[PDB]
Amino acid sequence: TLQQRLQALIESAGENWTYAIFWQISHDFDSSTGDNTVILGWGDGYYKGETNTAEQEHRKRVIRELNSLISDEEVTDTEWFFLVSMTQSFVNGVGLPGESFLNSRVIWLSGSGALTGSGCERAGQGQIYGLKTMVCIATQNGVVELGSSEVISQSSDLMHKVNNLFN
């Protein structure tokens, strides 16, 4: 399923992508505007990879709580950015993922300049937490997002793979 195809995408990718996220469409009925508003949210994700005391104690606590649920290394900023991304949703058109979907286009921010210089808060935070490259690629039922601590430039070879692995 989705996680499998997310791992597939970056375990064959041309360059070194740190993670991959599928933002998934849904519809909630706002009775005020009468609009069946389209929203992007966490569908699935795959992290591949490569602070201070108050920070690391906070993160380690969260990790063992999830471990308690499912079932002590330090938590890198990229692992942590990946995880906190589960909390985020995007109304159609809004934010890096929502712009990509609404306009059916690829948005490629390459280099730390691009990320902070974009004015997208998600890209900015991404730079803060070690990312150098952020890409959103719209598919049929959502958006595939790739991130990397390295700097990667627009390969059609990537957009090729994504088109294949998703309808």
């Binding site: 996680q3 949210g41 966490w42 699935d44 994700g45 795959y46 992290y47 990879g49 906070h58 606590r61 969260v62 990790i63 709580e65 999830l66 471990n67 649920l69 499912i70 079932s71 290394e73 938590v75 692992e79 990946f82 995880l83 906190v84 589960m86 909390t87 949703s89």
Partner: protein
């Protein structure tokens, strides 16, 4: 302690299961 064993409960090793948890739960845990 030279156990091979090996036991994996690191983030990198449980992310698959983590990704499947309802985002609203992750919100509460992250909110502390």
């Amino acid at each position: 302690f030279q156990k091979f064993l090996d036991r994996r409960r690191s983030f990198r090793d449980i992310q698959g299961a983590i990704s499947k948890i309802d985002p609203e739960i992750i919100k509460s845990l992250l909110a502390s």
